[PDB]
Amino acid sequence: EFTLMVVGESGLGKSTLINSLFLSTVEIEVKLRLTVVDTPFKTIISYIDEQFERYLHDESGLNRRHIIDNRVHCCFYFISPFGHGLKPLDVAFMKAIHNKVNIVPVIAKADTLTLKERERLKKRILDEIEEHNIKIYHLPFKEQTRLLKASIPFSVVGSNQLIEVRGRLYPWGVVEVENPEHNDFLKLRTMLITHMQDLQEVTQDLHYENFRSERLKR
């Protein structure tokens, strides 16, 4: 029972990555719900909040032994590799929903950046995360958990096309989706796969209860 939202500018490979992970709400079979949404927000917030209402209403009921959890457990936020950081629309969106959903920031179409360019954009996005007091999902073995945090935000490449593993062909070379020397796709997936319970659990224990307390107080 798990729900993942992907949000971001149109044309940033949002759909291709989702397809790459698993090989406007689609529901494939754990039971995964995916909600892809292209940025141009008062409906996005409201969708998220509406899933807390159903759940609060449902858990408040006399019949429970068929409750559907539609709460969004994670939101990949896609950032253009063309900016030098977060655009203020991106910051405003993330601030609108950071108290309600687990944000995982992702740099899109990372095959657009040299390694030097990549690390400048990551450093700059992390600093802006701090500067604007934005609350992104924080990961909870030794060195593999070390290396994964030290590469947030993940800069990914999607493709489901094959190359004489999946990749993208340019006259000067081939980007390999699952080569970590090429991009953080494997890390993002592994992280998604290894952290589902926590994602679910932080959604329950933190975002939903905060929703719930303000409600029963008001």
In sequence order, what are the residues at sequence separation of 6 or more whose Cβ sits closer than 8 angstroms to the Cβ of residue 142? Answer: none
Number of residues that bind a second copy (CB under 8 A): 25
Helices marked H in 24-87 — which ranges? 42-59
Question: Binding residue per annotation — 164?
Answer: no
Report CA-CA distances (Å) from 3 to 74, 109, 111, 188, 214. 7, 23, 28, 16, 24
Strand 25-28 and strand 32-39: pairing? antiparallel
Taking the complex as a whole, the smallest distance from the CB of residue 180 to a second copy amounts, in Å, to 10
Given the rule CB under 8 A, which of 64-72, 78-86, 138-146, 148-156 is the region that contacts a second copy?
A: 78-86
Q: Is 139 in the site for a second copy (CB under 8 A)?
A: no
Given the rule CB under 8 A, which of 39-47, 51-59, 110-118, 187-195 is the region that contacts a second copy?
A: 110-118
Q: Is 121 in the site for ligand GDP (CB under 6 A)?
A: no
Q: Is 100 in the site for a second copy (CB under 8 A)?
A: no
In sequence order, what are the residues at sequence separation of 6 or more whose Cβ sits closer than 8 angstroms to the Cβ of residue 131? Answer: none
Closest CA to 59 of 69, 50, 49, 45: 69
Within positions 6 to 25, which residues make up the interface with a second copy, using CB under 8 A? Answer: 9-12
Within positions 7 to 46, which residues make up the interface with ligand GDP, using CB under 6 A? Answer: 10-16, 38
Q: Is 85 in the site for ligand GDP (CB under 6 A)?
A: no
Given the rule CB under 6 A, which of 24-32, 64-72, 157-165, 188-196 is the region that contacts ligand GDP?
A: 157-165
Q: How many CA atoms lie within 13 A of 111 on its CB side?
A: 20
Closest CA to 5 of 84, 106, 81: 106
Site residues for a second copy per CB under 8 A = 9-12, 80, 82-84, 109, 111-112, 114-115, 161, 168-176, 181-182
Site residues for ligand GDP per CB under 6 A = 10-16, 38, 109, 111-112, 117, 157-159
